[PDB]
DNA sequence: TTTTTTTT
DNA sequence: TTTTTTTT
DNA sequence: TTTTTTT
C-alpha cells in the first residue's frame, strides 16, 4: 500500500529493501526504483537503483503488456 | 520489440535506457538500465526479480493516480 | 556445525545448496531456511526460501515431536 | 495439530504461516509455507519444501541454533 | 568417455548411474552417483558417494581382491 | 577383514569401506561410509550390481588417465 | 559499469 | 500463488 | 566511523 516518507514523498515497497517512489527535483517529477539501506532505524536510498523521468516511466508502462506475456510463456503467474 | 546481442528482448524507454528480460542461471530478471556504447550496460539501473516486478505492477494504478494529481497525463 | 558467513552470521548446511542461518534485519533476529547459489566464489542466499521470526521458530519447535511421530509411521528413521 | 483440505496435517506457526507434511510423487515433504485466504486456505509463493533427509539434517542443527538464539537473548525451551 | 554440462568428464555404468570427476574447493572428487532427468539434462541426485583421490586409490588397491571373491561366487570378470 | 554380517571389506579410509554383500539373492559391491556403534553403515554411499561394477572396471583406465593429467599420482 | 535472505 | 536431488 | 535517490 501507498506509504509516505518525511518529505511527504509517496512510496510503495516491492521487497524488504526495495521501493518505488515519487520525488520532485529541479521542478520535475521522478519515479525511483531503488534499494534502501537502514540508517538509524530509518530507510535511506542507496546506490543501486534508477530514477525515471515521467516520460521514461510512461514508455515503460507501454512495454508492460509485452513483458507480461513473455514472462507467462516462461511459466510465471502474472496477474 | 527489439532483440539484443545476447538474444534477450528489450524495449527502449530513452536514447540510452532499456527495459529487458534476461535469464541468469535459469532465473528471470526484469532489467531497467542505462546503456553506453561499446551498447553495454552501465551503472544506473536495477535487476528486478519476478516477485518484485509483480509487486511493482500492483502498485501501478496508485502511482499513476499520484502522478495524475501532480498534473501528468497517464492513460 | 556452526559455520560463519561473510558478514558474521552463523549458518548450518543441511544440503549442498540449502542452509539454515541466523541474521538481523530491522534490528530483529530471523531464522532463514533458504537455498543458496554459487557466484564468483562464495555461496549467496537465493530467492527460494522462508525467513522466520523467533516466535515463528519456537512455534515450529513445539511442532517437532508430532512431526517426527508422523514421519516414523511412514517408515522414516528419526533420531 | 490440524488437517488441511488435501487431508494433510499442519501445525500453525503464525496467523498466515504453516508447517505441514505432504505426499507428492510418493515422497514425503516437510513444508514451511505462507498461506492466503480464498473462500478456503491456499499455499503461497513464500516457502520451502524439505526432503526428510534435509529435515533430519535440520533436527541435527537445532541444538546449535538454539544455543545461538539464547546467546542473543531469546528465551528458548 | 564423455563430458557433462558443467564441463567435467564422466562414464556411464548403468541407465541412470555415472562415474564422474569434478573439482570442488580445489580438490578432485570421483563421484559414483545416481542422476535424474529434470530439464532434459541429467543432474546428480541424492544417492551416491564422492571419493577423494586417496580413497579412490585405496579402492583400486582392493580391486584384485574384490574380483577374486566375485569370481569364486561365479561371476565373470575381465 | 570381516564385518558383523560375515561379509568381507576393505578400508579405503578411516570411516569408509569397500565391501561385498549378498541381499535378496544378488551380489553387491558396496562403497559406503560407516559410523561408530560395532561399526554400522551410514546413509551416504552406493551399492553396485556386479554389472555396474564391471562397467566401472572398464572406465578405470580412462579415469586414471584424466586424474593423472590433473597431476595426481596413480600407479 | 547487470542479474536472487529477513514478519505482523 | 507448493511439494527434492553431487563433491572428504 | 565505516559507500549509498532523482535525465
Numbering used by the authors:
A (entry chain C), C (entry chain A): 38 to 116
B (entry chain D): 39 to 76, 80 to 116
D (entry chain B): 39 to 77, 79 to 116
E (entry chain F): 39 to 116
F (entry chain E): 40 to 76, 79 to 116
Tell me what the authors wrote about this structure, in their words.
Sub1 orthologous proteins, including the human PC4, have single-stranded DNA (ssDNA) binding, DNA unwinding activity and multiple functions in transcription and DNA repair. Nucleic acid binding is the key factor for Sub1's function in DNA-dependent processes such as transcription and DNA repair. F77 is conserved in all Sub1 orthologous proteins (Interpro domain IPR003173) of nine key species, while W89 is substituted by tyrosine in the proteins of six species (rice, mouse-ear cress, fruit fly, nematode, budding and fission yeast) as well as MoSub1 in Magnaporthe oryzae. In order to determine the effect of tryptophan/tyrosine substitutions of PC4 orthologous proteins, we have determined the crystal structures of the DNA complexes of the PC4 W89Y mutant and MoSub1 and analysed the effect of the W89Y mutation of PC4 on DNA binding affinity.
The structure of the MoSub1-DNA complex was determined at 2.7 Å resolution by molecular replacement. The asymmetric unit (ASU) comprises six protein molecules and three ssDNA chains. Each chain of ssDNA is bound by two monomers from two different dimers of MoSub1, which differs from the PC4-DNA complex in which PC4 binds to DNA with two monomers from the same dimer10. Nevertheless, the ssDNA is still bound by the same DNA-binding motif predicted by the apo- and PC4-DNA complex structures. Each protein subunit contains a curved five stranded anti-parallel β-sheet (β1-β5) followed by one α-helix, which is a key element in the dimer interface. When chain F of MoSub1 is superposed on the DNA-free structure, the RMSD of the Cα positions is ~1.0 Å, indicating that DNA binding induces little or no changes in the structure of MoSub1. The only distinct structural difference upon DNA binding is in the region of three loops (40, 60, and 70-loop), which are close to the DNA binding surface. The major interface with ssDNA (dT4 to 8) is formed by three β-strands (3–5) that are linked by the 60-loop and 70-loop and it appears that a number of residues in the interface, including F62, Y74, P82, S60, and N69, close in on the ssDNA upon interaction. Most of these interactions occur between the bases of ssDNA and aromatic residues, such as Y74 and F62 that are conserved in the PC4-DNA complex. Among them, Y74 of MoSub1 interacts with a single nucleotide in a similar way as Y89 of PC4 mutant.
